[PDB]
Design a protein around this nucleic acid. Structure first.
Lengths: 98, 80, 95, 103, 98, 80, 103, 95
DNA sequence: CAGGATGTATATATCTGACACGTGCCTGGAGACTAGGGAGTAATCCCCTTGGCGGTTAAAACGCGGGGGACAGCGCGTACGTGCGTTTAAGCGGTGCTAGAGCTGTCTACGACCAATTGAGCGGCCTCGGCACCGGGATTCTCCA
DNA sequence: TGGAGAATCCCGGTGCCGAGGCCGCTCAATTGGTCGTAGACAGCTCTAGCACCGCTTAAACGCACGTACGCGCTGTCCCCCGCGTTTTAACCGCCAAGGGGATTACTCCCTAGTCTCCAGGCACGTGTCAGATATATACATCCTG
């Protein structure tokens, strides 16, 4: 029999891995392309510094991590361990963003 | 550019949820997260381009992003 | 005798109200809320224009700083109609 | 006067004095108080027109704080502007969740 | 048998009554006594205007009502209609007060 | 004065929950709500008393309460 | 100099210049840059002490942003001071909920 | 030639670090974070002292305005030890 | 589905205090003039952003088996809603007293300002050691018999 | 409960680039007078806050009854996780233009400052009418049969 981990151990393993790391969790070029696509609807032919897209990526990943940290509390409050889009909507409308 | 919101991939949203402490992730979380990230980035990039075009520049510097974040109560340390 | 000379916004808010609703009045508590609203929006646009002048190492608040502060602070089409109203008033004023 | 040179109802001179004596910059341009008074008068006219419609729908002819609160919370842009703002004697918006209504 | 309303109808009647009114829902003298008792810990023999305690009562009732709306959303999220201290604690942790 | 937090009675907390849209209330809500109100009032009265004794006054005016609320992002219109 | 007259490491004259040129008040007193430099030096010494302890606990002799983030999010007073602040390349605190652990 | 004379707080933060932990150094990104932190709480204490001077119809920022701004902005025993440090420094500076 | 009971919206009187308007006056805003420096604009430099290319390789996409968790149904009890009667402070008005807020006047110490000087701090460069990475063993946790 | 396997931690060894210290220089901080307004302080007046008291009555409190909702249990199924395989695009190193940020020089126009005057706005009175309340009436809704 080949070895096989049970569902939830590797998830906790990568919780402990990514809560110990400091790196950026999104790839840099897709985020940079997304930033330039969003900025194309405000002013055409814009340039970005190398540190501007890094600042946007740090702020965006901190925002999304701190929103998932609240989504997880909203999921645990409903006696679940799965997060759902209604949990994200609840966290965003309790924070005062909708 | 067209439709780079799918460049925020499923394992990237899973890595951000693992850093957020999330054990199990529904399959509809990814399009919701992409829409949330797009709304956040629209608001910040709109303020950063306003700060940039006030200075009569064509380049969005890192200081424009830091000020655009600072006026949303999301102060960012490390970029001036 | 009289106490003190409070600079409120009440007569200008009353002129604006008489020009949008000529038969509607306003209470004193609602006039205090509108005065607090005008002071709050004033010191937010003025603080943001001050902050913009400080970022670009300028010493003057001009209508370009006030216009950028209005585009930063007001949401959506408020910032589209307020910039048009202010630009129209400045164009009229310099004539 | 400068309030009537620009066509405004708000005091351009008083806004100029508050910008000069308000510790905002070392110099204040001449079109800055005109622009700021025009923006303040527009933003006053919008909330006053919505409050007057909310007062007329309540069959009253005087604006009370309830009509200002209804005006600012029944409008997406004014609620985004005044999200972190409490209006005194204003109450709340009438809103019951759909789960609490009976079958 | 006399008349008797079912549990939940008069609750909805009070919801429609108090979401239509603008009064202060806490009594004035207990709230003013609570304000002077809290202010005793910061300065002895203080003094309050009549309008300062009304501004404190307006802000406190607005804070508690806007917290109870979030508490109701947290209760409804867990497929309940009763609000509980766990809903208050979740609403304050998501808003960022603890 | 001692123990005036019980002056925020159970019917007053029920009226504030009714204005908040709450249909059914547990019995342990009242002590949690009294603690939350005491924490809020402590932070606001502490800032208002700091503003008051900066001015070398002995009376907490409504302007000090308005400023103490304004510096916590809970700006209150109606009192100046 | 004024930095060494007061017993401080932070620049009292530069803080005085930034207060005089920051559009803060019409005049700036003499002891106010001294007080503000002393408060800035205390608040730097606290975060640097906690960051040096967190750097020594990871067996390192150099502060990286991770140690600053650990220093500020563990300390209650600094976490209330820096609640709405993102520190770049700081990560998060190691924190797993109790319901997610194996039973 | 040389570019420009960018003032920052890096050498004072380094002196403070070298008197608290004499063998621990700092990174460039951590020095940028500490510079942003010092500029941030400088702008908070200064913008609260400016408001305290404006609210009382005063035109001078004194150490009493800075002390009141420190007690308003810092939480708990930070505003006790920072007030004690600042009072000690102003006391020994006036001597 | 039907009718009684209860609550709430609606229409009329009546009464009060607050609001809309009128009046004196004063102080702050407007007009005119002068000086100087901030900023607008042109010109030049050189940094650093964008675009492209090619090999590596790690991450992403996709498919699949399975288990465990979400969700729905069901039952039980307890705790919370409703209502009634008793109690208790709140609210209101009326009065009195005085602390202190607010305003004015006078004086002086303190900060703005300006000019001369120099050393503190900043950019550049140079060196070496803390750390990132790599390979190998050691402990630790998980999972299935 | 224990052994196998996978994962993570530790422990030495190498290379490297970024921290840390030194050097030259320049510009901002310091020092010394001079002045003129801000504010500290004394004094005085008047508002408003605190304290008390009596009375009415509305809200709070306490209790009884019952229902409906929270919570625990069970069953089912389907969806998400772990893993292996194939693909794709990120990434890193290198190179080449060139756009535009950044700095300097210079001119000039716009705004601060001062002084003079007068009218717009504010405090204070004042009448009258919009709303608050009382009270009867009509419609809407809830609940139990």
């Amino acid at each position: 029999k080949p070895h096989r981990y049970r569902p939830g151990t590797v998830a906790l393993r990568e919780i402990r891995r990514y809560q110990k790391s400091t790196e950026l969790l999104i790839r840099k070029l897709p985020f940079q392309r997304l930033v330039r696509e969003i900025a194309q609807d405000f002013k055409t032919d814009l340039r970005f510094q190398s540190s501007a897209v890094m600042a946007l990526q740090e702020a965006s990943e901190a925002y999304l991590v701190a929103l998932f940290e609240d989504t997880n509390l909203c999921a645990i409050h409903a006696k679940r361990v799965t997060i759902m889009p209604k949990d994200i909507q609840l966290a965003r409308r309790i924070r005062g963003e909708r | 550019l067209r439709d780079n919101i799918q460049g925020i991939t499923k394992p990237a949203i899973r890595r951000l949820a693992r850093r957020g402490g999330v054990k199990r992730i529904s399959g509809l979380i990814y399009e919701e997260t992409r829409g949330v990230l797009k709304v956040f980035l629209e608001n910040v990039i709109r303020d950063a381009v306003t700060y940039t075009e006030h200075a009569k520049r064509k380049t969005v510097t890192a200081m424009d992003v830091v000020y655009a974040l600072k006026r949303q109560g999301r102060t960012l340390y490390g970029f001036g | 005798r009289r106490k003190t000379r409070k600079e409120s916004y009440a007569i200008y808010v009353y002129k604006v109200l008489k020009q949008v609703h000529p038969d509607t009045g306003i209470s004193s508590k609602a006039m205090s809320i509108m005065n607090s609203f005008v002071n709050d929006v004033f010191e937010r646009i003025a603080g943001e224009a001050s902050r913009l002048a400080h970022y670009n190492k300028r010493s003057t608040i001009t209508s370009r700083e006030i216009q950028t502060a209005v585009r930063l602070l007001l949401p959506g089409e408020l910032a589209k109609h307020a910039v048009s109203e202010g630009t129209k008033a400045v164009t009229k004023y310099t004539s | 006067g400068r309030s009537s040179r620009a066509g405004l109802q708000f005091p351009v001179g008083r806004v100029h004095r508050l910008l000069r004596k308000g510790n905002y910059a070392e110099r204040v341009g001449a079109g800055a108080p005109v622009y700021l008074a025009a923006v303040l008068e527009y933003l006053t006219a919008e909330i006053l027109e919505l409050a007057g419609n909310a007062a007329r729908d309540n069959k009253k002819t005087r604006i009370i704080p309830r009509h200002l609160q209804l005006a600012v919370r029944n409008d997406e842009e004014l609620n985004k502007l005044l999200g972190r703002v409490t209006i005194a004697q204003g109450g709340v918006l009438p809103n019951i969740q759909s789960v609490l209504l009976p079958k």
